[PDB]
Amino acid sequence: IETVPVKLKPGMDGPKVKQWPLTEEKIKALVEICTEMEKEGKISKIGPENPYNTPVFAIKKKDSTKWRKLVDFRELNKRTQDFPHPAGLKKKKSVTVLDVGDAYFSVPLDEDFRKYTAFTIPSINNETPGIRYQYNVLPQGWKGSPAIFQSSMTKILEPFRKQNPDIVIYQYMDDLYVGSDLEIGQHRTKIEELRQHLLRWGLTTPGYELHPDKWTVQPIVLPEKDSWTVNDIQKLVGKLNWASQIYPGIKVRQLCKLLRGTKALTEVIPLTEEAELELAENREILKEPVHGVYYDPSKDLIAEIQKQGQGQWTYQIYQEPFKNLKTGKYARMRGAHTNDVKQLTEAVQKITTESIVIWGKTPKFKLPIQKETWETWWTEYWQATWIPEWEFVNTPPLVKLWYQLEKEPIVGA
Amino acid sequence: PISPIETVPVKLKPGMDGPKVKQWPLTEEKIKALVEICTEMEKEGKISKIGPENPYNTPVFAIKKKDSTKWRKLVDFRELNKRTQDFWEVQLGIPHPAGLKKKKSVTVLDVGDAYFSVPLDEDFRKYTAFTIPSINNETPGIRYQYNVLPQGWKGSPAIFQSSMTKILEPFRKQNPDIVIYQYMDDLYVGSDLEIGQHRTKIEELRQHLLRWGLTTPDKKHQKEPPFLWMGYELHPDKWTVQPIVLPEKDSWTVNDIQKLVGKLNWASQIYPGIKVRQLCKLLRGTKALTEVIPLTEEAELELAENREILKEPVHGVYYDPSKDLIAEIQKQGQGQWTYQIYQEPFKNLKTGKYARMRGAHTNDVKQLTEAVQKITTESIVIWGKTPKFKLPIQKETWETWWTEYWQATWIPEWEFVNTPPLVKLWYQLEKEPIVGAETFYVDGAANRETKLGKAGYVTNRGRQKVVTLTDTTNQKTELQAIYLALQDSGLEVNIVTDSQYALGIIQAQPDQSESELVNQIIEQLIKKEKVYLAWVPAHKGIG
Ligand SMILES: Cc1c(Sc2ccccc2)n(COCCO)c(=O)[nH]c1=O
Known part of the structure; x- marks a missing residue:
């Protein structure tokens, strides 16, 4: 397949991020997945002549008992060249997220740009040199990816689109958000239909x-x-x-x-x-x-999270302090009692999802946690194809007390 | 010896050109040597003479060796190394002993000379140009260039590693029972094969490297455990x-x-x-x-x-992978903790300690957490897994703390080990006003310019006080107000203040800080059995 020439923003250089230490368990999974992908011509081994590098890691989605490879392309994406979002799905009754990520592995990537996709699999106790790979096909999590697969995606969806205009389909990276006002039954089945439609075209879409x-x-x-x-x-x-x-x-x-x-x-x-x-x-x-x-579309979104204790957390999405676009109170997920990180990550994800649904943009997180702690365990509970921007802060007591007073229904449901 | 392995594409930094530094004058003696040695490695195919079409040059030197009385040579690749591209990493992180697996027998392959066995990118070769001058302040000199990886060149170490990685790739696959560690010229091979079996595989390995122009010493050589x-x-x-x-x-x-x-x-x-x-x-x-x-x-x-x-x-x-990883931690004092990671009691893998700096305001429990974290990371990098923790703290103590801390925190699965001194919360602020207790409305202010202030209080019980302070700042003044309140108060006290800093003490309640004044306040707080600290809007009517 012919390939579109991709380039970095003017003046930028390739990313050189350091690989985070991974536990043996997930290191095995990565080797397993990588050797397989290598044979399939998805990625190729590279030498030390390539100085670029991007971190990688493995995660297990809920209802999924098999490892999946996630890469932190954030650095690369921010350096990649620039090339629509509705409203309806915000008002929809129900929305279903689909992992259309695999489809990218079908499309090849511009030879010369591949160097920038370099990544390394670490070795325990630095016993041996890390295995250095590089993508040949479109990488998951990369922004240019959907920006290239756009063509195939529109066509592939057209039939369903035209035979079901009462549904809204939105694609945010490896995800496909399909929302409809139809009641639970029709919606679930209609999604299943959309799935099979994609399955027919090749990629399994769970x-x-x-x-x-x-x-x-x-x-x-x-x-x-x-x-x-x-x-x-x-x-x-x-x-x-x-x-x-x-x-x-x-x-x-x-x-x-x-x-x-x-x-x-x-x-x-x-x-x-x-x-x-x-x-x-x-x-x-x-x-x-x-x-x-x-x-304001041109400005970035910010999201502050506050630990309320007792498993509760409060957050605010805004662009200018106090001028919040949305506010909410997250309750602990049934089970994550022993650790905050679980609740925090979960919270991070839920919020981003909503940021996507509503504005179709990833909000910068102001995380109430020590860097060291976050960096070491966030992967353990991450279950999203995307990774949002974040910074760590010293939560001011006043803001906490205020939002603590958020109204609560006499009975939720 | 020179291997038939593919060279690595090496190029200079964006927009830079090769080295052109002039050569230094040498004594008749050092010249003789350089000629001898250079002609030697020339015959070995390591270096080659070049024509005047190469404007690049690098300074070579001579010096008698380390207990030999024979002349050696050395090329100053500084300039070239400045222009050469950056390579990923030369594995900056060595295997810590505690992370090695016990093998029945180990062998050390000294693959030293190997640097001069791996061929350099032909296109790049030209940049390694160097000249052997002449006494006669001649016409030209004896020009040469490296065909193989130069000793001291920026890329050599990195390239050599990958080349080695490639060569050893097949052997490893066909011998998955053998573990090998690479460290520059040293190749450590270990396993659990009966002495003879081990020796044989080593020989296969030697033969293997040999095929690829990699010379290795005979007799399972030089160093021994x-x-x-x-x-x-x-x-x-x-x-x-x-x-x-x-x-x-x-x-x-x-x-x-x-x-x-x-x-x-x-x-x-x-x-x-x-x-x-x-x-x-x-x-x-x-x-x-x-x-x-x-x-x-x-x-x-x-x-x-x-x-x-x-x-x-x-x-x-x-x-020994077949056993658990236990990490015990102790507190030798405020900010000083000791830990020892082991599998079998007393049979320690690794030990260490962490010294902290009290900073603006911290507490022991927090520090314990910070330790557990560091230890955890260390373990993951070494044993690729997180150890089970044995910590000197009550589960209740932990619960009470983290369930109320403003910042998210977590300590992996641990178990309480009753080994004094146990870390405990020195004090706990009350969640509500104490009934039948004195209430101190504290306040303090100081002129920013003159650093002259006043701090005092008044109670619902009629009591009052004030102190004029020389050379101080508003922060100190406010804190001082709270301090005095605690001094004359009693076992149970209610203190209201408009200080932002006090608010911090409320939200974190540290048991250590850099400001001696705060330390005073802390010691004072630890003495009281019931203290409720409350804050109110500054410059308002609360008084
Ligand atoms: C390679 C290797 C080593 S040797 C080594 C050398 C440098 C770094 C790491 C290990 N040693 C140490 O045993 C020495 C005495 O028998 C070990 O116990 N296991 C190994 O796999």
Whole structure:
């Protein structure tokens, strides 16, 4: 097959990322997968003359008891040359993600660019030199990949597209998001049909899937008591004062007046009529998301995560601080009780998914965890073809207390 | 000897051209030698004479050898190495002894000369041009160029490795029961074959390398176990550390002290007991590196004490995959932890220790976690697996901590080992106001310009105080306010403050910090049985 010439952004050089140490277990899996791919002419061994390198690792998806190879092409992608997203699926009743990744292995990649796809399989205790490979066909996780397979993909989908316009198909890298408003039965089966359609063309394409709008940005609720103590008011005031950053209409003077005088924190204070109003008024302001916040396509999305303890986590997707596009409270996944990393990774994934569905873009994560810890175990629970950008931060206490007050349904479902 | 292996495509850095540095003048003697030697390797096909069409040049030198009284040669490839492309890696990470598997017999193949056996990329050969001058300040000189990998050239080490990798690939496959380690010119081969069987395979290997123009010594040569490998001493059943010798002298210079402390600090890893506390003191206010320091008696005892510890030669054992990996950790003090990874009790694989720096604000439990993490990573790189942990901490202690920490953290499957001192939470802030306890409304402020401030308090019980502070900053002032509050408070206290820093103490509650003031506050906090710290918006009406 003829190949499209791919190049790096002007002035950029190939990625030279260092390989992370992998446990023996997954190292075996990589060798197994790599030798197989080598024979199939997917990848070729390279010498030391190639200085470029990208990290690799193996993961096991839920409901999958066989290893899969994932590469961290993030560095390469950011350096790759640039070459649509609907809205409907955001409003859809149910969405199903399909792994159309394999299809790329069919298309060959521009000879000269291949050098940049270099990767290494590490050796235990540095006993032997790592096996150095290089891609020949399109690599999974690479951005240029879907950007090249586009042609074949559109055609392959056209029939289903035209015979089922009531469904929305979106492709984000190795994933194919198919959403429909049809009830559970028809949808599941229709997906199965779409699958078989792909199967017929060659590539195997593997409750049910997602649900777009059952995700509502819940407001912040303020507590109510029959009587308040100095301490309570102090807490309330502390929160409000901060909240004014998002809602400038929030005032707290009247409450502050009741908080004047060196009295016991346990001491109860009757709310003055004027304070009652100020409080009530603030509740009103807080009843809905701030106006004016609009998604700017050219700017990157940011996602802050906060550990709430007890398995809960809070997050915010925004572009400019306080001007959040969405907010949410993630609950611990049934089982991941002993470790935060599990919950964190899971959270990271769920959020990105939503970022994709809604904006079709990967948000930068501000992870509340020490680099060392994250780098060492994230792979162990990662179950996504993509890897989002991230940075680590020292979570400010104030923001945590605020979102902690996110409204919760009297009964979820 | 010259192998028929495919050369590696080597090219110069983007936009650079080959070396053109001139050659140095030499004495009649060194010239004779260079001619002899160069003609020697010329006949062997290692180097070849070149015509004037090559503008490149590199300086060659001569010098009598290491106990031989015979002249050797050396080419200064600096310039060439500066222009040569960057290669991936020359395996920067050596196999740690503890990670080796016990083999019934090992053999060391000294594949040294091999560098001059692997052919260089023909196109590149031209860049290795060098000249043997003439006395007569002649016309031209004896020009040559390398056809094989040059000793000292940037790419040689890397290329040689891969070439070797390729050559050994088949043998390994047809002999999966044999393990080989590559280290520059040394090729270590080990297995569990009855002595004779082993010897035979080694010979096959030798014959193999031979076919590919790789000369190897006869008789299973030169070195024999114990293998003195980089500070380590490898024996068939255990590895030992080379005797670290301490220079017993009577005059000590700054430099000599620093160097000493250095060795002593490396030793601490394998010898959990070594101390340099006093030794470091001898470096305070040093004017010159050559300045002599009168060794204090405290230092004499310390240095001497260290000698007694280093008297006992330590030895670790090898890895046996058929057994679990256990890692035990201990706390020798605030910020100092010791660990020993083993399979069978007392039969240690690797040991070490980590020294921390209190930083802005940390706590023991946090540090334990940070240790477990480091240890884990070390294990994965060595034994490709994570060890089971034996830690000096209560499961309850852990639970209470991590379930409430602001940052995500985790410690792999571990087991409690009751070995004092156990790490415990020195204090725990109350989650709500203490009933029937004094409430201190603390506050402090200082002029940023004049560094003059005031810090004090007032209680719901009527009590009050204030102190004017000279040369200080608002941060210190606020902290000071909280400090005083704790001083005159009592066993149970409620303290309200508008300090942002205090908020940090609330969210992390550290048991150590760099700021002595904070340390004071901490010690004070540890004394109280009930403390509730609360924060309120600054510049507002709360007072
Ligand atoms: C190669 C090899 C070695 S030798 C070695 C040399 C350098 C680095 C690593 C191992 N040794 C050490 O045994 C020595 C005494 O019998 C070992 O125990 N197993 C091995 O596989």
